[PDB]
Amino acid sequence: MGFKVKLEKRRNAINTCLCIGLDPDEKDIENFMKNEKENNYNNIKKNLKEKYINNVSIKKDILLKAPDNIIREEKSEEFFYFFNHFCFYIINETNKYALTFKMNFAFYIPYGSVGIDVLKNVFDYLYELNIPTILDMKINDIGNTVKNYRKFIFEYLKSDSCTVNIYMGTNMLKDICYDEEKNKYYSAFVLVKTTNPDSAIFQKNLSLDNKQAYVIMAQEALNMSSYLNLEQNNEFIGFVVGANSYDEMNYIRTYFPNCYILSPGIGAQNGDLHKTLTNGYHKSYEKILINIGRAITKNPYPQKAAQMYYDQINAILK
Amino acid sequence: MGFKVKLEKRRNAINTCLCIGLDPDEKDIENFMKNEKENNYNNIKKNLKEKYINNVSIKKDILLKAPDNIIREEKSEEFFYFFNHFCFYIINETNKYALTFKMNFAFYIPYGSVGIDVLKNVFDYLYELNIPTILDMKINDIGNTVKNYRKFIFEYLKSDSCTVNIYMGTNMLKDICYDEEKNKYYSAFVLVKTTNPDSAIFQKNLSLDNKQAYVIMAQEALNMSSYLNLEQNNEFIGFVVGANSYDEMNYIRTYFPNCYILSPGIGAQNGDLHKTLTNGYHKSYEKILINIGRAITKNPYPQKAAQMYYDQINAILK
Numbered sequence: 340m341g342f343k344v345k346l347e348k349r350r351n352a353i354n355t356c357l358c359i360g361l362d363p364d365e366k367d368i369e370n371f372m373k374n375e376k377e378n379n380y381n382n383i384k385k386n387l388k389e390k391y392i393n394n395v396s397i398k399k400d401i402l403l404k405a406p407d408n409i410i411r412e413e414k415s416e417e418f419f420y421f422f423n424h425f426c427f428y429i430i431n432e433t434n435k436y437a438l439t440f441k442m443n444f445a446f447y448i449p450y451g452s453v454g455i456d457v458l459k460n461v462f463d464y465l466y467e468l469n470i471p472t473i474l475d476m477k478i479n480d481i482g483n484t485v486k487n488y489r490k491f492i493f494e495y496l497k498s499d500s501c502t503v504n505i506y507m508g509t510n511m512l513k514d515i516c517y518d519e520e521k522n523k524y525y526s527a528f529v530l531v532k533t534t535n536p537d538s539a540i541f542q543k544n545l546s547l548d549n550k551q552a553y554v555i556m557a558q559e560a561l562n563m564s565s566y567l568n569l570e571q572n573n574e575f576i577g578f579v580v581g582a583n584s585y586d587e588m589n590y591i592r593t594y595f596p597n598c599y600i601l602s603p604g605i606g607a608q609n610g611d612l613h614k615t616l617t618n619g620y621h622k623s624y625e626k627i628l629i630n631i632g633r634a635i636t637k638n639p640y641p642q643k644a645a646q647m648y649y650d651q652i653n654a655i656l657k
Numbered sequence: 658m659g660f661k662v663k664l665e666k667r668r669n670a671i672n673t674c675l676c677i678g679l680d681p682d683e684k685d686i687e688n689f690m691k692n693e694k695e696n697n698y699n700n701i702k703k704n705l706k707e708k709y710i711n712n713v714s715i716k717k718d719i720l721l722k723a724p725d726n727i728i729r730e731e732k733s734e735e736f737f738y739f740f741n742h743f744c745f746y747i748i749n750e751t752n753k754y755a756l757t758f759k760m761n762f763a764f765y766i767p768y769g770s771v772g773i774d775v776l777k778n779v780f781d782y783l784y785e786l787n788i789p790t791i792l793d794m795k796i797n798d799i800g801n802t803v804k805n806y807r808k809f810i811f812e813y814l815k816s817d818s819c820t821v822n823i824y825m826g827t828n829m830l831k832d833i834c835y836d837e838e839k840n841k842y843y844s845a846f847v848l849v850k851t852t853n854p855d856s857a858i859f860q861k862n863l864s865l866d867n868k869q870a871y872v873i874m875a876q877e878a879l880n881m882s883s884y885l886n887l888e889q890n891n892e893f894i895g896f897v898v899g900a901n902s903y904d905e906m907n908y909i910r911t912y913f914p915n916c917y918i919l920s921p922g923i924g925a926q927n928g929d930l931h932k933t934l935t936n937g938y939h940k941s942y943e944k945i946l947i948n949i950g951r952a953i954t955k956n957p958y959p960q961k962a963a964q965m966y967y968d969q970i971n972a973i974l975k
């Protein structure tokens with residue numbers, strides 16, 4: 340059922356709000372392939388034995404084959420196989436620490452269709468482990484058009500949420516968060532403050548009445564969720580606020596109690612995790628997701644790294 | 658070469674600024690297939706005679722497969738077949754009238770990888786035709802992440818340009834419009850004024866120094882075009898300005914002569930073409946692109962709809 344119900348009952352099960360990012364780059368794949376080839380396909384063998392690997396839908400005939408795919412012909416299909424197995428490897432090594440997983444679309448698109456097949460299988464894999472999902476795609480377009488992203492994200496990947504950029508207009512969120520022909524509803528996180536070093540330039544130097552753009556936008560987003568029947572239908576519109584923007588985090592949390600927040604920036608940006616950004620927030624702590632990607636995924640022991648953050652988080656939660 | 662120079666050359670060769678939108682939805686593909694499954698594969702037989710379809714890189718064998726279906730092997734590939742053949746038919750029927758084709762990424766993703774194969778084949782076919790290309794994808798993210806879009810768009814599809822949403826910042830363009838490790842420069846059109854009903858909330862009501870958002874945004878974009886050194890390299894950052902934004906079109910062509918503007922909104926939105934759009938913001942006219950999508954591709958006779966619009970735009974260019 341609904342995502343609000345999926346976040347609470349999950350954080351009940353595992354007691355954190357760590358969100359693990361899975362953004363594999365060319366180097367992550369090329370390197371997992373090297374290690375696997377020089378270690379008799381170790382983690383792939385692990386992968387290939389996990390229970391719910393059968394629940395993926397794209398190219399099972401190649402994915403679930405044992406690795407005599409080196410040059411037992413099947414040359415062309417190598418990249419597919421290791422890209423996907425790498426993703427499986429990180430999910431398997433870390434899912435016991437993660438409330439949600441956030442996959443950023445841009446990492447899956449630059450080789451063409453092969454990465455979309457990987458992104459599809461990764462989303463099936465998470466679905467079946469019934470683990471909350473986010474696609475970080477910052478979608479934005481006109482309505483007839485944006486419904487294509489909705490078909491992509493919630494029907495095909497079957498994702499539980501997505502990031503959206505609302506600069507074109509708050510109205511786009513109507514053909515993102517609701518399908519009428521289906522009568523289904525869906526959740527989203529709108530960009531409020533992002534972690535890029537020049538983000539102030541528009542989300543701050545721009546204002547409507549001595550209010551900064553991010554507040555207006557935040558205010559706009561949350562009035563659109565109220566306008567749709569999402570809270571009621573167990574879905575939400577929430578906010579992306581970067582981990583390095585502390586003042587703004589304390590602003591949003593007080594002047595918007597009960598909102599869902601998704602917070603990127605800890606690790607490869609770091610700054611202070613235990614500033615007014617994780618703390619200041621509490622009950623139903625699924626409402627403040629701390630995204631960590633590369634500090635886990637580029638760590639030689641992703642399991643270790645995941646626990647490290649799961650415990651730091653599970654300490655500051657007091 | 659470089660995009661400006663490609664733009665100039667075609668503009669002399671064909672005397673227009675018509676940009677044709679290639680956004681095929683599901684009704685388009687099914688309808689294309691039924692008419693052909695009726696009219697004896699008339700238009701597909703014509704695609705099969707075209708020089709460049711022998712150059713396409715994904716599923717040549719399928720795509721070139723005997724005009725009919727002869728109800729053989731593939732049912733797996735029927736949707737791919739008729740999607741790609743619909744796009745080739747539009748291009749074939751309309752290309753002599755187009756200064757540029759714009760493809761909207763959204764229409765090519767919601768079926769998973771199959772439509773990314775189509776889109777790839779469509780950019781390959783356009784590349785071989787040497788016809789100016791825009792991917793309308795409205796990309797945005799942080800720098801490390803956004804290089805993946807630049808890869809997809811400029812290396813993988815070999816597009817000439819794309820649409821970008823700069824709301825997060827201007828810094829992202831260093832990683833879109835510029836590739837240092839290849840020392841390549843690429844062109845883009847940033848969102849300035851968009852055609853969705855509520856497009857003013859942020860675009861017009863936000864401000865700094867009594868200037869509206871879309872004026873700072875357009876200014877700052879151009880400040881990065883100068884920082885990146887893109888003109889010197891025959892490339893640019895330009896502006897998306899909705900056809901129905903009469904006043905603002907006038908304003909930007911006034912305060913930023915020589916800028917490159919992309920204008921969508923004619924046909925499947927109202928109102929018309931002269932009405933200020935093309936004359937508000939006239940120049941040396943590859944700099945004012947008039948995008949027309951559905952009113953060409955959803956018309957029974959696309960070549961004729963193309964011609965008719967091409968006639969209108971030329972007439973208006975005095």
Ligand SMILES: COc1ccc(C(=O)CCC(=O)O)c(O)c1
Pocket residue numbers: 359360361362441443534535536603604605606607608609630631632633634799
């Ligand atoms: C889930 O994907 C991510 C995304 C970002 C980070 C950072 O910490 C870097 C953020 C910045 O440098 O602005 C990460 O570790 C994983």
Ligand SMILES: COc1ccc(C(=O)CCC(=O)O)c(O)c1
Pocket residue numbers: 481483677678679680759852853921922923924925926948949950951952
């Ligand atoms: C790119 O080709 C297109 C695609 C879609 C439309 C619309 O349906 C309305 C556009 C709007 O409301 O701004 C169009 O006029 C042209």
